[PDB]
Amino acid sequence: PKQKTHRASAKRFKRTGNGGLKRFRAYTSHRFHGKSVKQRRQLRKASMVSKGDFKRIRRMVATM
């Protein structure tokens, strides 16, 4: 019928208009001992999604 949007994938992602998606950081949940002082200084924030990868967007994250 319709194409079912994966709601938990929507809980993974958040994309922008005329632009890419915001991807929160890896590693940032479970232990914090061995990750560095600088990695604590910088890995609260995170960067965007890839370019040549992530083209498996289609269309598993439809219209959310």
């Binding site: 994938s9 809980k11 993974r12 992602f13 991807r23 929160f24 950081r25 890896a26 940032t28 949940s29 990868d53 992530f54 498996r56 289609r58 598993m60 994250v61």
Partner: protein, 146 residues
């Protein structure tokens, strides 16, 4: 033209009869090359698949719960106020009788962007941004929010 029905460009082109013949072939192959999971019937492959490794999205943290009481106002530009002059008592009746958007989130809001062509004060709102209150309220407006 019923004597000599003709078609124009672009609307029509041959639907590609894929899987016959010798020229395009594609029934021997269908673009594919034999002897693989790709090379079979069904088209059976799940899209997100890191080869049995967990996926990109499968490595994501669970971020941010969602307000059930999330509610907005179907925000319009002030560029439609550049369209309509003055439309005294700029309200939802001016908005949907202007037919800008009909199904609206209950209130209305304008940007400071868009221009101060309108003259009327009594703009009936639920909530206009204070950046636009600088514009119209410094440009011959009165606040009637809700």
């Amino acid at each position: 033209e019923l004597h000599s029905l003709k078609a124009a460009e672009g609307s029509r082109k041959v639907r590609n009869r894929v899987g016959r013949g010798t020229s395009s072939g594609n029934g021997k192959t269908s673009g594919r090359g034999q002897k693989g999971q790709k090379s079979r019937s069904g088209g059976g492959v799940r899209p997100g698949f890191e080869g049995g490794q967990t996926e990109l999205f499968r490595r994501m943290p669970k971020r941010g719960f969602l307000n059930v009481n999330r509610k907005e106002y179907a925000i319009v530009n002030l560029e439609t106020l550049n369209r309509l002059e003055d439309g005294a008592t700029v309200s939802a009746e001016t908005l949907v009788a202007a037919k800008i958007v009909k199904d609206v989130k209950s209130g209305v809001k304008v940007l400071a962007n868009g221009e101060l062509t309108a003259k009327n004060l009594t703009v009936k709102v639920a909530k206009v941004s204070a950046a636009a209150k600088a514009a119209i309220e410094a440009a011959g407006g009165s606040v009637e929010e809700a």
